[PDB]
Amino acid sequence: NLFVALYDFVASGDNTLSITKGEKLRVLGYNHNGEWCEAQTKNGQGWVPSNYITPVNSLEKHSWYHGPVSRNAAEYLLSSGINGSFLVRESESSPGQRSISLRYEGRVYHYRINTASDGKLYVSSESRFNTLAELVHHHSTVADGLITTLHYPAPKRNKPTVYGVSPNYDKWEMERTDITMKHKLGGGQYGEVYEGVWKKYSLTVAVKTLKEDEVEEFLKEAAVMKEIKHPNLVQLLGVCTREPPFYIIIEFMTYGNLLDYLRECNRQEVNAVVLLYMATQISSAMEYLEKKNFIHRNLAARNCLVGENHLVKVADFFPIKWTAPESLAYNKFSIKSDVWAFGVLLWEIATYGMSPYPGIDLSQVYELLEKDYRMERPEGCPEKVYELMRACWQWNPSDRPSFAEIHQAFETMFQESSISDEVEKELGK
Ligand SMILES: Cc1cn(-c2cc(NC(=O)c3ccc(C)c(Nc4nccc(-c5cccnc5)n4)c3)cc(C(F)(F)F)c2)cn1
Ligand SMILES: O=C(Nc1ccc(OC(F)(F)Cl)cc1)c1cnc(N2CC[C@@H](O)C2)c(-c2ccn[nH]2)c1
């Protein structure tokens, strides 16, 4: 059938098609993995990312329909809202289960959408509708059981994730001259990493360059990155590995590293909901690396990048404070030692980037960990979050939760409350 564009896409490659949000398209076919599709508009024919469009006969065409988003992710999306800001979401775990998340007087209210035996949808038993768009349209005029009216659909601000810049199989080599190299990133903090502009592809990029005094390591890094495909792990955009200097390209992350971001942010804007949103994106990324059996070895807030709308990406650019005991004693690294490091990262988030083990000499850390000493619950930290850190910090690696269990815990943690209320109580008690 017919499709509608949900996001703007600017033609870059020769086989690509420029599209505007709201525009109709006919879909001719798909690329090797279904992530790109060949579409036809009134302006032409060409390749577009599949997730930038949706059938005209689908719920995703509505600005208020955010699809599979969690209770907590909905609270984040509405944190920038006003009274009447709202969205409709589906449960990822239990398909077909929908809810309304509505902002009123700085709080988010969640309502289950009920289905009758004849298939009619309702929030209030007296007001049943044949379709979801009719239910939404009704509660957009009268509250009729909701705290207030549904007036402002929450914006879908971040563009969907696209792995690379091409629909074609293993086309990663790009043209060096198409990038205008600017200054070194973060005032030389990351080494041979530069800010660049990729005009052809309409991107601001971060470019890692190879200079004399290891080619084999730089090539292995590009090769590893080709297989890392998750919305919260840095996505490789392309390489220049034919002639020197060798390039590795990713999209530039506006707000730099997470550690400095936590330390320098506006704490009124970056509240408990925003902090939980960032921790959950990191846990999703680590669940993905766990499935791939990939050992990160360097998980810390300093190794995470912050983009627009608090989009967090795990990357890999004193470290004793993040290191598991078996790794310190026997140089044994595993997914379970990444779990330990995640617990410390959670403590960095819970404190707005404080340095771990305050007042403790680095030479005494292992000895203290052995006697079952652990960092104290940060001030304002909800007990359930501190229990998770304590689970990550189990002496024995096999006693530690897996990243799939950590992610599941976050998504079922404040299922009948708000982390903002939990933090409020801990700051009071
Ligand atoms: C052999 C091997 C590779 N890896 C691995 C490499 C990376 N690469 C980068 O993070 C990386 C590579 C190239 C570039 C250009 C960058 N970009 C970068 N680096 C430092 C700072 C910034 C930056 C700073 C401020 C604003 N925006 C970006 N960007 C990252 C990422 C991963 C991970 F975490 F995703 F699993 C794994 C591990 N073992
Ligand atoms: O929101 C807070 N914590 C939180 C959020 C999410 C969590 O979950 C996770 F999953 F995101 Cl890690 C876990 C903990 C928070 C609020 N206020 C704080 N203050 C104390 C006095 C005041 O001036 C500033 C602190 C704080 C700063 C330094 N230490 N403590 C933290």
Curated annotation (Swiss-Prot):
Tissue: Widely expressed.
Effect of A272T: In CHDSKM; increases kinase activity; no effect on protein levels
Subcellular location: Cytoplasm, Cytoskeleton; Nucleus; Mitochondrion
Sequence ranges assigned to domain Protein kinase in this UniProt record: 179-410
Active site (UniProt): N298
Sequence positions bearing Phosphotyrosine: Y7, Y52, Y65, Y76, Y109, Y122, Y152, Y163, Y190, Y194, Y330
Binding site for ATP: 185-193, 208, 251-257
PTM text: Phosphorylation at Tyr-7 by members of the SRC family of kinases disrupts SH3 domain-based autoinhibitory interactions and intermolecular associations, such as that with ABI1, and also enhances kinase activity. DNA damage-induced activation of ABL1 requires the function of ATM and Ser-363 phosphorylation.
Family of the protein in this entry: Belongs to the protein kinase superfamily. Tyr protein kinase family. ABL subfamily.
Subunit annotation: Interacts with SORBS1 following insulin stimulation. Found in a trimolecular complex containing CDK5 and CABLES1. Interacts with CABLES1 and PSTPIP1. Interacts with ZDHHC16, ITGB1 and HCK. Interacts with STX17; probably phosphorylates STX17. Interacts with INPPL1/SHIP2. Interacts with ABI1, ABI2, BCR, CRK, FGR, FYN, HCK, LYN, PSMA7 RAD9A, RAD51, RAD52, TP73 and WASF3.
Protein name: Tyrosine-protein kinase ABL1
Gene: ABL1
Residues of the full protein shown: 64 to 512 of 1130
